[PDB]
Design a protein around this ligand. Structure first.
Ligand SMILES: Nc1ncnc2c1ncn2[C@@H]1O[C@H](COP(=O)(O)OP(=O)(O)CP(=O)(O)O)[C@@H](O)[C@H]1O
Ligand SMILES: O=C(c1ccc(F)c(F)c1Nc1ccc(I)cc1F)N1CC(O)([C@@H]2CCCCN2)C1
Ligand SMILES: [Mg+2]
Length: 282
């Protein structure tokens, strides 16, 4: 196998990259191969049986091979922290980009949609894996201008171990999913639409309100919409098609891949790498 032998003593911290909903992430050096990697440590609290299942289930990431999916190097258990080892991405996430930029322009977001559309299609068509948490911080970028999906739900047990410590991003869930319905394919698309709006407008796009009020608001009130003057009608339409509340009527990936917004975005020359430097200074 490419590495086979992954162990704690061989990595070497280059920096903390930050903390999320259950894991902490570092840029590391992998001494024995010279590979640069991101490494996410997740503390849990579980029987060596469960722990080792999780590590077995994660091995399926070795078979994810796509330019739109962050690359997998290995996963192992150590010092009560499970390790996911992945391609490092020197841009961080669109959520870090957004904080930096204020607001991410419609054209760059066209590039983002294409990558995301294609990321999900890959996962679903090759591996039958749903993402389950599409949101700006689970979308990564690098100086080579690339845009990739991470933190998707490969492991049914890890989802499980993560669900009864967190049902984390409640605010990004689809109305059907807040209602208790099982995860649809149609949920990733909702969450995508909502992420583009958020990056387009530069803020979580819902009236400010207390969290439990938010969850009723989402099931009960209409979906968000782009400000209808500053954004092209293609983009607005795109977004609205992702955000139909009724999952039977929401657009799917086959239909979004041929949308006027995507066609148009596809033909533009957007120097995203360059913009990333302009904006995040590498
Ligand atoms: N492969 C990678 N390369 C570079 N940075 C990464 C990375 N994977 C994660 N990060 C960054 O590390 C920080 C923490 O990641 P983490 O996934 O734990 O938090 P998050 O911000 O995505 C909330 P959640 O835990 O629900 O996904 C984030 O800024 C994330 O963008
Ligand atoms: O880190 C994860 C995550 C959750 C389930 C799972 F199977 C994973 F593999 C996870 N990590 C992961 C997957 C693919 C790659 I390439 C690299 C990875 F590190 N999550 C889900 C998450 O976004 C949080 C968990 C709490 C609920 C909301 N989302 C963070
Ligand atoms: Mg994440």
């Amino acid at each position: 196998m490419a590495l086979g032998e992954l162990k704690d003593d061989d990595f070497e911290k280059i920096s903390e990259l930050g903390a999320g909903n259950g894991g902490v992430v570092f840029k590391v050096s992998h001494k024995p191969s010279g590979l640069v990697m991101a490494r996410k440590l997740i503390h849990l609290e579980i029987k060596p049986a469960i722990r080792n299942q999780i590590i077995r289930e994660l091995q399926v990431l070795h078979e994810c091979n796509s330019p739109y999916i962050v690359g997998f190097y290995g996963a192992f258990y150590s010092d009560g922290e499970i390790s996911i080892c992945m391609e490092h991405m020197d841009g961080g996430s669109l959520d870090q980009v957004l904080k930096k930029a204020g607001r991410i322009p419609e054209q760059i977001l066209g590039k983002v949609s294409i990558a995301v559309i294609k990321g999900l299609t890959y996962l679903r068509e090759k591996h039958k894996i749903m993402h389950r948490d599409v949101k700006p911080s689970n979308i990564l970028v690098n100086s080579r201008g690339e845009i990739k999906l991470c933190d998707f739900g490969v492991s049914g047990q890890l989802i499980d171990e993560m669900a009864n410590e967190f049902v984390g991003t409640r605010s990004y869930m689809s109305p059907e999913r807040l209602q208790g319905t099982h995860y649809s394919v149609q949920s990733d698309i909702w969450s995508m639409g909502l992420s583009l709006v958020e990056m387009a407008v530069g803020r979580y796009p819902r009236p400010p309100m207390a969290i439990f009020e938010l969850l009723d608001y989402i099931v009960n009130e209409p979906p968000p919409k782009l400000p209808s003057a500053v954004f092209s009608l293609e983009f607005q339409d795109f977004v609205n098609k992702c955000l139909i509340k009724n999952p039977a009527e929401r657009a799917d990936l086959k239909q979004l891949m041929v949308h006027a917004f995507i066609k148009r975005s596809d033909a533009e020359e957007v120097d995203f790498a360059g913009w990333l430097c302009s904006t995040i200074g590498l």
